[PDB]
Amino acid sequence: PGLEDWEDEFDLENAVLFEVAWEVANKVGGIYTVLQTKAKVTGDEWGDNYFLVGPYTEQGVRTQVELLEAPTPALKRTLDSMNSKGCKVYFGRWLIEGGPLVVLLDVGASAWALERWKGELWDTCNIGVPWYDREANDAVLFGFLTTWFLGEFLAQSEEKPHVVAHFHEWLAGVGLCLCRARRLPVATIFTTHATLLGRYLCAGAVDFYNNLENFNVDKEAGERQIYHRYCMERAAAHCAHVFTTVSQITAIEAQHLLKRKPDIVTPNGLNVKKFSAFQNLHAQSKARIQEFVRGHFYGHLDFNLDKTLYFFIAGRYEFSNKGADVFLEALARLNYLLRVNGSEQTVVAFFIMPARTNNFNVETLKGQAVRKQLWDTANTVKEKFGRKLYESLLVGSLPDMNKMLDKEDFTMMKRAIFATQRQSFPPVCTHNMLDDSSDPILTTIRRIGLFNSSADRVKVIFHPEFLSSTSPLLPVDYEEFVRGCHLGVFPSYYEPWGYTPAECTVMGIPSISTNLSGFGCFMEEHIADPSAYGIYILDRRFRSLDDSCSQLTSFLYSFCQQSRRQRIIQRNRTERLSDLLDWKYLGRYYMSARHMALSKAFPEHFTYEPNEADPRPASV
């Protein structure tokens, strides 16, 4: 389909690009995966002219960085001068899929120059940094060393090439500000993945999404003592040849907060080849989740397991940001509706959110051991029955069915039966809370009244611990378990881009998101009639909370009323949707951003035609 070499035929000649980011070869956040995935295609387009600028960490260099010698004499002399001037910079490869060249800068080896660098920064842009941040000083040092390295590289080259600088986050924006300050012949691109004040204002302040035009950012930066971070972020955003954002919602957020409309939007992608390794895997995962729910619900298995649906929500433990309260309230409403209608369907909800636990509870382990004992007894009895039937059937005689069970088989069956006796109800959580009184999820469940009762048609399972293949009760990784679920509900409120819903959708599981996330807006914009492809968008921007909850309840009820053939068709449609989120297509927006940057920086040599051409209308 649409490859990188479609329509951007451009004279690249002697051009070098720097992918400056604070997290390269240092796993801190989530856009680490974005850089790791984009590196392969970007380097394939760029050949050997792709560099990454980032801080040095002993752990990172020990685990995934292989030190090497730089291939050009210019890098040799720049590194020699850089080490001989009182700093400490190393060179090597990044041990990832693409294997790009990396320069690592040790911010701890330049503490002597912070006093003069702060003064120069203030004399250049009137930016001050308080002494107690311990993070902004690191950003300032990283920017100073980055701009000094760029200046030395351009100055010491016999022939000056076209250098492109690309920064990603406000810990690196000081470098962009300084390189623009010193009038270096460089093309600067600034891309933001999350507004700094967005996270601060969403928590505490109410109706942050209904008051964008009524926010005078200066004060809100003032009272929180994050004024200087916003100052450098906004300054770096302003003095950029090309300004870029990751999603539309963040685009409006930056426009109303950073006071600059982003020129191009660049969604985050991923490599679909590794995830693709498609119904056998889902069937196996569903069967083993059936095994798990049989283990947990021993002694209360009064509902058909062929008409049960599995819902799940995952991510970091943010009750409000992920909208778990909305999901719980809508689950209660759906339980009420199903109980009224007298339906045979059952909904089992999973909640994978980290919490502060110590160990498992006795009930879950007891149930799992009981299930294992029942399975073993059934296997032993069925093996004996099969052997007896085979031997009695070779002699051409009908099996006398009343004599295939003897004393010890009855003893084992009886032991199993008394093992499956229980008077209480299955627990709603599989661990022991250390803050059970202050837990919001459990408090909400208690308020809405879901205790896995016999009459309840909706079951709630809370699994705080990270999902691992070595777990005593769920020995499975995140990917395989997600593959088997029926639907993924993410009623998020504030999220610049949804990594988890993207992973769910690329997997081929129908998902529910909001118009309030980058993924939701991307899907809504790039396809028509999204409901047919297994994606349901919750309108949260132009609606109240009760409206958002009723709509989500209606979506869930509509999903629960679908027949098996309808579910199969919807699942096939969502299967044939993974290629929209791969870097093979999403990498073109970054390339267009680069072309804009070169056109702005060197209009004499480069000229760009503003082509914004780039699709899935319908299937029924």
Place this chain on the structure above:
Amino acid sequence: SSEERKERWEQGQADYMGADSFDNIKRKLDTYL
């Protein structure tokens, strides 16, 4: 004025209604572009 404003910068008391507002940084920065 200059030195005392610089001090208020490191100790972090910014008069963001007036001289320490981002507008001054804007009019200083816009000359370089």
